Design an enzyme around this catalytic site. Sequence first.
Site: not given
Ligand SMILES: O=C(O)[C@@](O)(COP(=O)(O)O)[C@H](O)[C@H](O)COP(=O)(O)O
Ligand SMILES: O=C(O)[C@@](O)(COP(=O)(O)O)[C@H](O)[C@H](O)COP(=O)(O)O
Ligand SMILES: [Mg+2]
Ligand SMILES: [Mg+2]
Lengths: 140, 466, 466, 230, 355
Positions: B115, B165, B167, B169, B193, B195-196, B286, B326, B371
């Site tokens: 919070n 990965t 391609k 995607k 792999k 792709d995500e 990932h 990239k 990657s």
């Molecule tokens: O979707 C993509 O872009 C990739 O498959 C890379 O493809 P390329 O090999 O063709 O670039 C990877 O998921 C990213 O690198 C993830 O980023 P990170 O590792 O920073 O989480």
């Molecule tokens: O942990 C807390 O602070 C609360 O229990 C509120 O307590 P009080 O009633 O004592 O203030 C709630 O979880 C937050 O309001 C969450 O925020 P939101 O609703 O913005 O996600």
């Molecule tokens: Mg990927």
């Molecule tokens: Mg709470």
Amino acid sequence: MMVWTPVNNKMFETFSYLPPLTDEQIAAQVDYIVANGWIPCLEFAEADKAYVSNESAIRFGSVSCLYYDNRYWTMWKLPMFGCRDPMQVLREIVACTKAFPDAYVRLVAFDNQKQVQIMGFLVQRPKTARDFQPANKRSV
Amino acid sequence: AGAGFKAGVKDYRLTYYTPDYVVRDTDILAAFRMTPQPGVPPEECGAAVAAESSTGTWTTVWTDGLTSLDRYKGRCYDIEPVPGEDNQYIAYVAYPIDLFEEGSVTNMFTSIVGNVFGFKALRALRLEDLRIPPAYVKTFVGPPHGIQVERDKLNKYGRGLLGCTIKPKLGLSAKNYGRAVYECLRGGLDFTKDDENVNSQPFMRWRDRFLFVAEAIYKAQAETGEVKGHYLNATAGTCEEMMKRAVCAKELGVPIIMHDYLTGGFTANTSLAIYCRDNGLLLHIHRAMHAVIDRQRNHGIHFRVLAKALRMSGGDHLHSGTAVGKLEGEREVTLGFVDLMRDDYVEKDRSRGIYFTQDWCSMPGVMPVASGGIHVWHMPALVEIFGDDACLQFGGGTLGHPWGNAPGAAANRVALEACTQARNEGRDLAREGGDVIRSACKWSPELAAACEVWKEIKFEFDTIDK
Amino acid sequence: AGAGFKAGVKDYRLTYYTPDYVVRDTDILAAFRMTPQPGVPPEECGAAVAAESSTGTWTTVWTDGLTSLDRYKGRCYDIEPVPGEDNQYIAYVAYPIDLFEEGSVTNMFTSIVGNVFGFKALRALRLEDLRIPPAYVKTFVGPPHGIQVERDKLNKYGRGLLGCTIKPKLGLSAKNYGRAVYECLRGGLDFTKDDENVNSQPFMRWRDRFLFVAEAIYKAQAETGEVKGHYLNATAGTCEEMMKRAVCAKELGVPIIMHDYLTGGFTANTSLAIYCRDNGLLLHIHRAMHAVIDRQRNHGIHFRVLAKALRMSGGDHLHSGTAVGKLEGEREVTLGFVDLMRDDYVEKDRSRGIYFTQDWCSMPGVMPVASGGIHVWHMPALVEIFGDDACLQFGGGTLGHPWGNAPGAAANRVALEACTQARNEGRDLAREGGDVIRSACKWSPELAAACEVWKEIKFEFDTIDK
Amino acid sequence: AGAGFKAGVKDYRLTYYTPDYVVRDTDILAAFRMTPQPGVPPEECGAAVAAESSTGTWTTVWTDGLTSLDRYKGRCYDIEPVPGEDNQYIAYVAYPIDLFEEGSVTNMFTSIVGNVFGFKALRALRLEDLRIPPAYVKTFVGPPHGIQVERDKLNKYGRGLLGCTIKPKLGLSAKNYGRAVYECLRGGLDFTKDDENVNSQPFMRWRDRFLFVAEAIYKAQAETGEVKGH
Amino acid sequence: IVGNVFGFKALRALRLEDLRIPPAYVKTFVGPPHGIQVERDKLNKYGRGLLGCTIKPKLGLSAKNYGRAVYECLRGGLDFTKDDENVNSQPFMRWRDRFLFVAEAIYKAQAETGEVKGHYLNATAGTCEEMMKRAVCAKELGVPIIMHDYLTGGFTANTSLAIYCRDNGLLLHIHRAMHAVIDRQRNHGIHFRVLAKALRMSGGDHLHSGTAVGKLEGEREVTLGFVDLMRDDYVEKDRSRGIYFTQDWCSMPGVMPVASGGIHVWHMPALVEIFGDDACLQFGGGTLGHPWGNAPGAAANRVALEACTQARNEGRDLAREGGDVIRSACKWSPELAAACEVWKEIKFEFDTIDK
Ligand SMILES: O=C(O)[C@@](O)(COP(=O)(O)O)[C@H](O)[C@H](O)COP(=O)(O)O
Ligand SMILES: O=C(O)[C@@](O)(COP(=O)(O)O)[C@H](O)[C@H](O)COP(=O)(O)O
Ligand SMILES: [Mg+2]
Ligand SMILES: [Mg+2]
Ligand SMILES: O=C(O)[C@@](O)(COP(=O)(O)O)[C@H](O)[C@H](O)COP(=O)(O)O
Ligand SMILES: [Mg+2]
Ligand SMILES: [Mg+2]
């Protein structure tokens, strides 16, 4: 465009995509082992036991994930604990390859802090091997 | 009369700012980069963060007296000024270990980041680091296998792992997916792999993909004689669907699955990690969506915290960034969290963004995966940054090779092996990297073709997450 | 007409910027607030976002030719400048429905927000809104029950619901928890709840809490003759644990459970919503961690998108903010997403941050929950902002009452009913609110005590999320 | 040439007696009351106990060199003579937290008390105490409820609880067992109990007992207005 | 029988020496999953003692290195290797990783030697559910044998595991970890012969019996007594061997005694003489401590065993001629000669406590 051949083109993990290591290049790798304080070891296998296979999985339920036969090779003597002499390693390569001239032989090194093999490459293949290509024939 | 119940509002700092507190070795510690609103003292702001992430609310409650607030309260115990900033502070908060559910990353985040980021009294808040004590670390299953066991199972040593990965995607059929996979793996890559965002879609349903990919893995493995894998995506809409995908992977005997831990969520990720441990599947993670949270310097959660969280929740690999590709990722910051991912003990080092000494108490390390927009010319820099304990992934850098996937894969494999050999021989990749690649190019036609296509391609922009 | 594969890098805008595209009624549309790096054209930046969230990567791949890129590519189809900003743009991107897994919010986020926020070529990126088409909406189970069904099951009509979070957040024993719940519920509150971070901890294990709370619910219900409930937190470290908690709630016959959907995750949330549908449990959703993502104007994901995502994943209640409490939430923006949460059809309205017309095609509405730093003097404003279809929650505002929980609950209930009656009689709560409360104070001693304690308490700060 | 593999037997004390070791806050510590055989030094006996309850055996093995013995070995770090005894010592042993399976008391005992009590080189051995560090404690589920929760569930405060084992130990029928339970509980005991050796036997099968006992508990509870159990 | 009486103020000490378990009670137990005869039949091993080896160091080896050590031991001539009693699942090596690598090692050694091989995979765990998960994995890998620490795991868990082993055709090796806490002192505790009878009833295919000559205590006459109680169908009262009651086992299968702890090649004649063929002899340090490594270490032990067995069969008296038998084998086998040299002077001779 050249085509990577799928026929009789088996590889052997680390350094198998480079030109075959010269005696000087092997010596350099051995120096690297010694420089880092790793434990050298030799392992060998007959041709039928050289590459990963699946035969034991006939005995399994659904538990073959990351199980392969032929990952273990046979240890030459013992790992060379305390070895700080590159010439000793080179002499063991000669001895191992002499005793098993028809075997695949690989040099490995261990790190006892990570407890893992930290280097490895092939140093001999049998002369009868015909399931691999010379570098210049890997593509056509 | 002693201290009793007094209704009404009082300053948070009266209870939650404790500058003389000596932290316990079981405390969870948090470093927040805090930007207070005008007229709000840093001590009150830090106290507020401590209070509302632990035991306190906006007004005094009578129920406090039934328990021991001293025992349970979060405590703001130090406030550091930020050099170069007029209204930024690092607030340090200590949380008793008793506040947390054992084994639950979900619960840890819910308290610490639940919070407090929405409080009107602050303009911005960023969680920079967390000290997870050994007593809490030990409550987690953690990574299904970790770096050492993964190498041992795959029988791969002495170099970084190589991946790719597939391609485009989205849009490829299951059969074409498998075809691409086979061609990549057979050329020298260890892994391919999904792709995500490849889950199950009208153009390609997941089970069809899994089967064709299985055929491709086994074909490439038989052809090369090296162990091969493809990270099959188990990410799904429900835990039940996610598990069905994991089970199929198990039944096919394939080595590795993947999960998008932030978009799937920690609850699902932890379940999958446990399944992977119990069934011997490697788990690739990932980090899809992380940049929504971790990009800006002033607000969010730094990736190093998301990486610690993953190591606890469980994963064998985690994307780490590339620095040179990239997508953004500064070198020093990356070196810092890569150590946090891999090592057993990481000393405080503010020059790499490490705010606390972190002791992992033998929890397995997670393999970093570099990657995104990388190609053969990046190889020396990548080997220099990561060393051998990393996976380097080339999507476009393989399927974009002018001769196709197998030559593309071979080029990357040749580049990696050439750089590794050069390093081993004593060459300095930071200075000689270009020479290493140029020599390999003259020797390998596959590599030469890759070098030509991407010679001028670089990604050099101003860094946001400094 | 096919063309040859040409290896190499080209501008994204050549494929992915399509300003003449006419969007299809089945397309998912996204509005991104985009801040490009210097020297990067807005069209190229928008095209990069479209490309890397759909089908494309950094270099041309041959595999594109096996499929139809036209069919599958995301398309940047419009770019708007942002008034008051020199380097900010709204890029509109259209995604074919075929890109998404049916029923999976996880998949939708993985594509749209997976990687693009980390691109070096942009300085900042914020997802402001998403147009979810009927054809995709219909693939989701959605809320287990929704507003109408919930009211019918509880037999509660004609006013906002009243709730209360037990405090201190952490540190109370299961027995003391139940004691606090009974006293709150018997005084006139409809609900009480576990704090978001109350899961299962050394000081209070979950099953002990569940049993004592069950006793408290049933005692208060017998005493008052009104249906009572307490949102029992199912949030857990694993899906398996989460489900064990939901099952226990089912077996105790209690009406309602809660889940922290962002910290637990969408995969876990969707599973729980499905369980709740099949077993007749109401599901309260806490938005813990949303402000990490949704606070800053320049980067992240606006809460309205997180709210739409929750409506699809499933929840009967969702926290909406208060506007007037301790946590940030601008009035106009809040009214906008409250409509998006509750209504069947919401027309485009840029003055309330609604970028797209949203048709929910009969998917049930989610009850907004206003919570956080509110007390009796806020009641008129809350009834005016939300109307009857809301839950108003007073944690500190009940357990902070000088006479304890039951009088605290009674004070809040009297204030609510007084405002509701006044509105019904034609009074303007925006102007006469103060008078309504003062009149009720003179009548109710419980309310008078609450009014005195919190008379001067306000939360007025500069709004960040403008 | 560095330290390498030398086959053969050497004294345990060379590796496992480390009197200058500073214990870590994550270490499991054991206090053993040790009675060595004549001619066996206390240091060697303490080292033996540390070795054979952790990583070592009777002769040097080559496989030690693949791992880090320093990281994993049990260490005898202190030896105290026992006042009033000529041949008794307290040997203190520290075990790295890494040696133990999380959440498993079975594993902890298997290591610490597994084999060492049978060593020929000692005449007697007694484990007096163990220091279980917080980092290991936290791996256990622990008691289902514990004292506070139990009182809360039973609604019983301000005095000790009172119980009673049904007698004769064995030989009563299920019906007579329940009869005895009812009469005990109704008079003011909080609990009654099965004798330790009452499981399921020809004279009284367990399910028959459970049902009659249930009837007795609920009868006594209704009669007294106090929560009852067996 | 032993629940409360040992703590009575009115006694200074109490020791349970023996129990007569009548046939009518014996017959109520499932007993050993297989027993000596069936085990030999399944393994296809006859005419000599079985040979085993505990992997060392006890703790600290990775799963991969564990499997590596196992393969090298088994390929040299050992029938079995085993997890140390305290090897369960730990940060340095998780159980399932170990099970898989060990499976690879077993199958490699078996293919290489043409003899059936096994490794006692430890199912001992913190909970019954975890224990069963480990047993199931062993079943699914098709491996022959698992182990359990019956005193530290407990009788309830042991009996469950024995029943599972019977129903799924797994051999069950029993380690007696913690027994000496209970059975060492003459004046107080429970004699091992009672703990052995209890195990035969609860169920186990092998049980550690002691060596007499090794690093751990066990008097010869007492040991011969309980070995008969473990193996035989009918054992007559014999106070000179500590047998207080005639014991009729009413056809309950016999349990294979396992001699382990500080033994080496020079002990072989004495071991073959004490136990005969129906025993397993285990050499941990005595294999992994060989100067040439595991395979030569295993071969040395195997040659020693076979030489003693042949000599006995030919009518030689191992009690007198044992030294001569080993010396002759040393001159013939270089592997054995290396072992004999290293451990020639190593003996464990101390005053016996449990007299
Ligand atoms: O979707 C993509 O872009 C990739 O498959 C890379 O493809 P390329 O090999 O063709 O670039 C990877 O998921 C990213 O690198 C993830 O980023 P990170 O590792 O920073 O989480
Ligand atoms: O942990 C807390 O602070 C609360 O229990 C509120 O307590 P009080 O009633 O004592 O203030 C709630 O979880 C937050 O309001 C969450 O925020 P939101 O609703 O913005 O996600
Ligand atoms: Mg990927
Ligand atoms: Mg709470
Ligand atoms: O842990 C050990 O010490 C052993 O592995 C032997 O190792 P070595 O072969 O290296 O001596 C055995 O478990 C003990 O013999 C058990 O004792 P017992 O058989 O008396 O129960
Ligand atoms: Mg009793
Ligand atoms: Mg042992």
